[PDB]
Design a protein around this ligand. Structure first.
Ligand SMILES: Nc1ncnc2c1ncn2[C@@H]1O[C@H](COP(=O)(O)OP(=O)(O)OP(O)(O)=S)[C@@H](O)[C@H]1O
Ligand SMILES: [Mg+2]
Lengths: 164, 148
């Protein structure tokens, strides 16, 4: 499933190169290689110098906001109110995100301290996120949690894996 | 103002997203009830999840019922106010004949129908006189009085 869908996504991203506006901005997706050996095993290409989005975000949240909730505390508070009406779920969610502030803007300030490199890498991040967002809407792509999204800390772009 | 609001509520009813949501919740309720019928804390959790589905479905259907009320009421108010929008009679008629069973639509129509000039319905007598029946329902007591 993952290999077939990686091939489909690569083909559509190749379609993107035939238009002036998407080609001018190098809009496309980053690919990897899945190789199924048997119905129970495979070789997956370990993408070179990335870091999972969750593995960056959970330490950074407590490094930059030591008075906020931990990530596990937010997860548990959200999971406890899972068998309740929508009003209580939304109230718990607002209460939890009022004590949890985003820290993603630091990923670029601590891997690229030069403003030229910083600006280029943040633009790469925004463009690859936009392309994969539209392409994954059109193809119904789901399972987009933090362990399926990798941050390339050499070029700034995101890689989506596990596309099944 | 009234035509604006009526067209908004109507567009909120015939929304493909909301119709697919209602259909998905309906299939979920059906399948969960069938699964409960299979087994009859397995039963306990299964029926708890079934009850949660029921609450979600009640919420969605109540939202749609409010939209229907507002749509019918504002179509009737817009017909009674000006002559700018007079094909609202055809749309009101389609919407009312689709909902001839839902007593909420019939209560709203009963409340607001006597303020529209009958010249707005005068050219729709082929469709009105085709639905006449003697059934003693509220829909028929409104339809026969309008035709009269
Ligand atoms: N091709 C890949 N290249 C680089 N990192 C990867 C790749 N595939 C997975 N990872 C990461 O390496 C770790 C291994 O995770 P996996 O065991 O593959 O599945 P998982 O998502 O971590 O666990 P669950 O139960 O599926 S949420 C995770 O932190 C992934 O984000
Ligand atoms: Mg995974």
């Amino acid at each position: 499933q993952d290999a077939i869908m990686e091939q489909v996504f690569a083909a559509v991203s190749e379609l993107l190169k035939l238009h002036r506006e998407t080609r001018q901005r190098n809009l496309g997706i980053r690919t990897y290689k899945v190789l199924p050996l048997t119905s129970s095993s495979g070789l997956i290409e370990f993408v070179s110098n990335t870091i999972p989005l969750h593995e960056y975000l959970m330490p950074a949240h407590e490094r930059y906001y030591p008075k906020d909730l931990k990530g596990s505390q937010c997860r548990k508070e959200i999971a406890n109110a899972q068998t309740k009406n929508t009003e209580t779920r939304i109230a718990v969610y607002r209460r939890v995100t009022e004590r949890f502030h985003p820290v993603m803007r630091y990923f670029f300030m601590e891997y690229f301290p030069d403003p030229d490199e910083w600006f280029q890498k943040r633009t790469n991040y925004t463009r690859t996120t936009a392309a994969i967002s539209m392409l994954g809407h059109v193809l119904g792509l789901g399972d987009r949690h933090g362990h399926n999204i990798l941050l390339d800390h050499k070029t700034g772009e995101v890689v989506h894996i596990d596309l099944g | 103002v009234f035509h604006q609001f009526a067209v908004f509520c109507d567009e909120q009813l015939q929304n493909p997203d909301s119709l697919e949501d209602l259909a998905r919740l309906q299939n979920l309720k059906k399948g969960k009830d069938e699964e409960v019928a299979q087994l009859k804390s397995h039963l306990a959790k299964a029926k708890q999840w079934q009850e949660l589905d029921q609450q979600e479905l009640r919420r969605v259907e109540q939202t749609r019922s409010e939209f229907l009320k507002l749509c019918i009421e504002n179509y009737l108010l817009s017909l009674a106010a000006s002559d700018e929008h007079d094909n609202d009679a055809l749309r009101f008629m389609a919407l009312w004949l689709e909902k001839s069973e839902e007593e909420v639509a019939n209560e709203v129509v009963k409340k607001w129908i006597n303020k529209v000039p009958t010249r707005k319905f005068a050219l729709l007598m082929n469709q009105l006189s085709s639905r006449l029946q003697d059934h003693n329902t509220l829909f028929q007591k409104l339809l026969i009085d309008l035709v009269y």
